[PDB]
Amino acid sequence: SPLAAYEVDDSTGYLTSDVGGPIQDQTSLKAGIRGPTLLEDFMFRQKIQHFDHERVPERAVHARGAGAHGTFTSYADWSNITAASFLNATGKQTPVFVRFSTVAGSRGSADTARDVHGFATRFYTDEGNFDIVGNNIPVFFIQDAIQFPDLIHSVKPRPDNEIPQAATAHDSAWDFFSQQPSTMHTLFWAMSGHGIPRSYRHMDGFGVHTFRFVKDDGSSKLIKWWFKSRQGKASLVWEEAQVLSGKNADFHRQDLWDAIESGNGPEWDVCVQIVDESQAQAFGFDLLDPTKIIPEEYAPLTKLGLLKLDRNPTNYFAETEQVMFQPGHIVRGIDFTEDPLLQGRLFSYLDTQLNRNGGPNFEQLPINMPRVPIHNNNRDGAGQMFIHRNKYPYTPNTLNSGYPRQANQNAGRGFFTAPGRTASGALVREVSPTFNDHWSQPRLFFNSLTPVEQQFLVNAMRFEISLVKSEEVKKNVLTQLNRVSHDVAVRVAAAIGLGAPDADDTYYHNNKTAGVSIVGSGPLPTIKTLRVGILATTSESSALDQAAQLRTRLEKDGLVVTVVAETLREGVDQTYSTADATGFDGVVVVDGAAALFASSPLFPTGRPLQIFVDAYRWGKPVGVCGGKSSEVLDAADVPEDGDGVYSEESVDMFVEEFEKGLATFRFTDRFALDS
Amino acid sequence: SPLAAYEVDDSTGYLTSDVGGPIQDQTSLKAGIRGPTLLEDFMFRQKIQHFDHERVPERAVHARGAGAHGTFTSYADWSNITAASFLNATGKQTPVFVRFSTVAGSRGSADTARDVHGFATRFYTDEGNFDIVGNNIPVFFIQDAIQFPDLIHSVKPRPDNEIPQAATAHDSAWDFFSQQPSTMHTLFWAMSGHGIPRSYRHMDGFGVHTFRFVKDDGSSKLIKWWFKSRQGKASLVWEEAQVLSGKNADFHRQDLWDAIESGNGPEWDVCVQIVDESQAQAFGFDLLDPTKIIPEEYAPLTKLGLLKLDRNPTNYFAETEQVMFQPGHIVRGIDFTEDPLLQGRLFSYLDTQLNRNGGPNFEQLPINMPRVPIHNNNRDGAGQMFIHRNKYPYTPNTLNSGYPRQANQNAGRGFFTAPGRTASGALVREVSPTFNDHWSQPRLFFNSLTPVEQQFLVNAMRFEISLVKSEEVKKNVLTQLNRVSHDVAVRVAAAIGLGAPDADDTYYHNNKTAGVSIVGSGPLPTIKTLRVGILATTSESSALDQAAQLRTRLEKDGLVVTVVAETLREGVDQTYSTADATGFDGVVVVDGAAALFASSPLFPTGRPLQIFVDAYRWGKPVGVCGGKSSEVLDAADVPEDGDGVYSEESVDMFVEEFEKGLATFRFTDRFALDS
Numbered sequence A, B: 001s002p003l004a005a006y007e008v009d010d011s012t013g014y015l016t017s018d019v020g021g022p023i024q025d026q027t028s029l030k031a032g033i034r035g036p037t038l039l040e041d042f043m044f045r046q047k048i049q050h051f052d053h054e055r056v057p058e059r060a061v062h063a064r065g066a067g068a069h070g071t072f073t074s075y076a077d078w079s080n081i082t083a084a085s086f087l088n089a090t091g092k093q094t095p096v097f098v099r100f101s102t103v104a105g106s107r108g109s110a111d112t113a114r115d116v117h118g119f120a121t122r123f124y125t126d127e128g129n130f131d132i133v134g135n136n137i138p139v140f141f142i143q144d145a146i147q148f149p150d151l152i153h154s155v156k157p158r159p160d161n162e163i164p165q166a167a168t169a170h171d172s173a174w175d176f177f178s179q180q181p182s183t184m185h186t187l188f189w190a191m192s193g194h195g196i197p198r199s200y201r202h203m204d205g206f207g208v209h210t211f212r213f214v215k216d217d218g219s220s221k222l223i224k225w226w227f228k229s230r231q232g233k234a235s236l237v238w239e240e241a242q243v244l245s246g247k248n249a250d251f252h253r254q255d256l257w258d259a260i261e262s263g264n265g266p267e268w269d270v271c272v273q274i275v276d277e278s279q280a281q282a283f284g285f286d287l288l289d290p291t292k293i294i295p296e297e298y299a300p301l302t303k304l305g306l307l308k309l310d311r312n313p314t315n316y317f318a319e320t321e322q323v324m325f326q327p328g329h330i331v332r333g334i335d336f337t338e339d340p341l342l343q344g345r346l347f348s349y350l351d352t353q354l355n356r357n358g359g360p361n362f363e364q365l366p367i368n369m370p371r372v373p374i375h376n377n378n379r380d381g382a383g384q385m386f387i388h389r390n391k392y393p394y395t396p397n398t399l400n401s402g403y404p405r406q407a408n409q410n411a412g413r414g415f416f417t418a419p420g421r422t423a424s425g426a427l428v429r430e431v432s433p434t435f436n437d438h439w440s441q442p443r444l445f446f447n448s449l450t451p452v453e454q455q456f457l458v459n460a461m462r463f464e465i466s467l468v469k470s471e472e473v474k475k476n477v478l479t480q481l482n483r484v485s486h487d488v489a490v491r492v493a494a495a496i497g498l499g500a501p502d503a504d505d506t507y508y509h510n511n512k513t514a515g516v517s518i519v520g521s522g523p524l525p526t527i528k529t530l531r532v533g534i535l536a537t538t539s540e541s542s543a544l545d546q547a548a549q550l551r552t553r554l555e556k557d558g559l560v561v562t563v564v565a566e567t568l569r570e571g572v573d574q575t576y577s578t579a580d581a582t583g584f585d586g587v588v589v590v591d592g593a594a595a596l597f598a599s600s601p602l603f604p605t606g607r608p609l610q611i612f613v614d615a616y617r618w619g620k621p622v623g624v625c626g627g628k629s630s631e632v633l634d635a636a637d638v639p640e641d642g643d644g645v646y647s648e649e650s651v652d653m654f655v656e657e658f659e660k661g662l663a664t665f666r667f668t669d670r671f672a673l674d675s
């Protein structure tokens, strides 16, 4: 581990107190064998006090998440655009830690809630820790940090009864969205498949804000951070996500943990869009506005390096729960912009760690420590782990020979604000009029999805808005949707029994942009780690032989195979009782098992066929291997000539066809469209 | 009341700071219109500091839960058995607050996880706050409080990756259960329908421990607390509970909130079993052992009074999240026993509130305050809300005339330890040999369930143990189950492909006890609040007329009716998109809607039929109203002669039959049994 010096080994030895005294911990000290417990039982109290105090406050947002360690490797010397030391040489490696998350749910809510997702990355650089605290969607709901508690209160559970958990599907959230039209862009992303990603590994990361790269000469450029997934993009379908939220609330954290342990650690190209300072207002919107993307057509990506996650934590609480990210963790070569959302975040993340840690020395926790020396005059505070030798911790001093020395642009590789930055004007609590177009980019995004994706987005809105009780809120929602697309407002209105307002075409257009569609991003670049369920039976030795031969051929290509049957035994991983279509990316029935697809105390009535039908309905590749397919496919009402439906006698031919299906990932012709 | 004095109304007025200065909170103060945010923006920082610090640590256990206010009313003057003031007169009323919970899951986890459930009741008595901090299961996993962190660490998520959430279905939990055989009794309860109750209202509450009732003369008797539900007992089936965990993680808190708002606030008879001190060891087990029940046949229940919950909280965080229960909140007339589980609890609950509240003045929060004056020499600490006038807070004093006075058995209605209590022997960390029978009572419990209930319990163990990776742990589990029942171990072993160990009949017997079976507890005594889904269509004016006439007749009898259709409109509550069988206790299809049961952009393929089939498979009353009937029942493969299947042309006859079905609640003949 990068954190090996802090590890504690309990694989041998006798139980001790926290101060090394050998003890026991299984029976209380009592006044007689059936007597009361004694106050002098220090073994009891130290153990129970620790237990009683194990919990800390969950993060105010992004409470539900999971993390891993890895490495970042630079592809080049990037001194031509940034002074940043971690980017200063081809092949230069820096340790990282990444945490992924949802936003709204509390820390035991479901991974597969519909939500924006966090993607937070720490680079433990040789010039200090640098954090990029990003999301899987490139734009944010609001244009000023001061509005964050309004947004978050509205999407979190109603505060009288704390209902509903981890969901925007309630009156307050849609009230906020409909009254605060800045929200439209992020709303459209959340209501697309980007709100229900297949895994953390199958989503991109974005810094959201425009930042600055600063060279050692003082010149600056504007950048956006883009982490492009090397696993490809993929989503769940909503009905699948809902079932998975109940069957496996830990789906995304399990997926990441398993990928790392199998040696399939996920990778991203860490990229930037780079533009000149003079282009802040050149693209038809303001680069200080975090509700806006720069279309790839206007500014192409530059690949800076490779991020790879390849080591799981030892202790979740100590590493994942305690990691404390800050946009204020910045290094020389990077600087902020006057994005009023970013500006306020700088305050929040330093302050909130006091709540979580309960004390000011949270940067001393192993996961938060830097990998280089600390020289400063910060002292004392609860939980102080350092023993400082310098007894003159003030500047300016002569009694410690003027150390530590000041670092700045010209000495000590100091951080420095980009020297060409200026401010001019009144001290104002006013919104820039350059931020006022809330609807054109939502429309750009919607235009850029495929017809079936558009249907899914409409369906997500129909689902959530149908659960809003207030007729006034629902009308207000249609008013805002209508400014993005009259068609969206018409199709959503049909579900909730309202009339859509008349078209208002001020912000309508037909422009599209590349790289935002999931369905459109073509077949996955790899099928390693994807999950194949083989449905078999113990009633036929030949079904288990078919299952074993399929397993060998699928495992050869790095697929994760689960053989399912009525009961466990050698070669069977899971029972029908525990199995669900949400556990697989493709489902194969071996034709020896055909009789299960027409009752048993060992699983719920119809379970084997339900797994197959659910997989088909949710767009997954499905098939029958062995050559006799009719009985299964007729029971399922699955047509044999369907796209992403397979039937072959030959195991080799079956797997070759099926693997193409897995790369296709989803067969979208199985979903009905509005007329 | 301390609650009413601290209520804050924001239905009018201008925004202020926390010190009453009128402000704004929508735009940050900036150095020019596109400039950086200023440090002097106090409006920004106060708002965000508050947001940053909103969270507090969740409870170490029972983190997921919900609460309500109500009243306890005594049925009699109970002076003849206890000095307790809240029980001292017929009709005497005391305010209560109750919180219900699961045990293992974090905040945000699903209500319908399989778990033990908390049932914690605060009586705000005229002689101080009295808490009975109970569960819905009458026995606990362990016999000594010092083991609690062992139990809890084993059932909570594995600490390297924090998987899995809110579940015992993992190796560590079953390792603990198999190595600590005290766990068998509670394990059997949790694996029965008691682990997945239909609602908080449909479960009982238990103090678990033997306590003492103490009279003003100093004599004592041993008691067990039993809160008997007046709503009846009911459970979910596992497959339903899993789906509901995903479709509605807030199911139990919603059910409670809704019942209270409709004027159907839940009721319990608060009862005790009362036995003499001399019977501590008379029933074949030790009354100090919290893994044991007293069979009703050995000691019948005395009804002390009525508990009714009838008012929802105003603010969840302030009331439900902050309520801080303690078994140390005891009143004169009650005393502890030397149960080593109870003994340690007394320490834990005082200590843990320091973690949650962050300071020592947690009893000053309105929900925790008493309803009588506080006179003591406790002073200072963080968050001190009182201004104490007594400037000589020490005893003994003359400078405050010797006040406050000491209270005890003889003066001031003081609490006093039961004066007959003694202790004798060595100071020991040893377990009493009277606690060593871990298996007979698990067997008593199993024997007392119906055949189908026994099958559900076996099925729950087959499900969970099949997910254990370690073959050695699975074998160890069978070893322990085998000591309860060879048949259980045989039936469980069949699912996980192991052999059961040979019968070991040391603890086997055929005794039964009344009142532990859910299936056996007869029809529900009321059907008010139960949920009827009517599946209709907007295609047919006659389908909506059928739905509306059914609605009128069902709503008359206090049922919560939802009409489901493709889209909302007058008379339709929910779309097929958001509807699920988990949302209903009974499902009716109107005849006019027959065509939906043979594709649409408005809901997933087969959703209407799936709701009906799911409802049937999970044992619910189902029917078709209109008198075509055959087409829908044939499509569903639901037999018309089936118990809990209704088929009538007449709406009146349909409802009369259907309502008996709702009282029956579950039709258990639809579940397969081991040979």
Ligand code: HDD
Pocket: A059, A060, A061, A062, A065, A099, A100, A101, A117, A118, A119, A120, A133, A134, A135, A140, A144, A145, A146, A148, A206, A207, A208, A209, A290, A323, A324, A325, A341, A344, A345, A348, A349, A352, A353, B048, B052
């Ligand atoms: C002014 C308040 C505020 C605003 C405007 C934002 N956030 Fe934030 N964010 C917080 C206040 C905050 C916080 C309260 O300070 C959190 C909670 C825990 C922590 O360490 O910081 C947080 C956590 C947090 C995490 C979890 C980091 C982790 O896994 O531990 C992510 C990924 C983000 N945020 C991402 C964003 C993005 C991409 C934003 C807009 C572009 C954003 N936040 C705006």
Ligand code: HDD
Pocket: A048, A052, B059, B060, B061, B062, B065, B099, B100, B101, B117, B118, B119, B120, B133, B134, B135, B140, B144, B145, B146, B148, B206, B207, B208, B209, B290, B323, B324, B325, B341, B344, B345, B348, B349, B352, B353
């Ligand atoms: C020695 C530690 C220990 C032991 C043996 C137990 N508990 Fe406990 N219990 C806790 C330590 C604890 C705790 C850590 O102190 C909690 C967490 C939050 C709090 O207020 O106390 C708690 C919370 C808690 C709650 C939630 C209260 C609420 O709604 O806020 C209930 C209902 C119970 N417990 C019930 C039981 C029952 C019926 C037990 C055995 C008969 C039991 N506990 C044993």
Ligand SMILES: [Ca+2]
Pocket: A158, A170, A171, A172, A173
């Ligand atoms: Ca709401």
Ligand SMILES: [Ca+2]
Pocket: A192, A193, A194, A235, A236, A453, A456, A518, A519
């Ligand atoms: Ca999609």
Ligand SMILES: [Ca+2]
Pocket: B158, B170, B171, B172, B173
């Ligand atoms: Ca485990």
Ligand SMILES: [Ca+2]
Pocket: B415, B416, B417
């Ligand atoms: Ca006393």
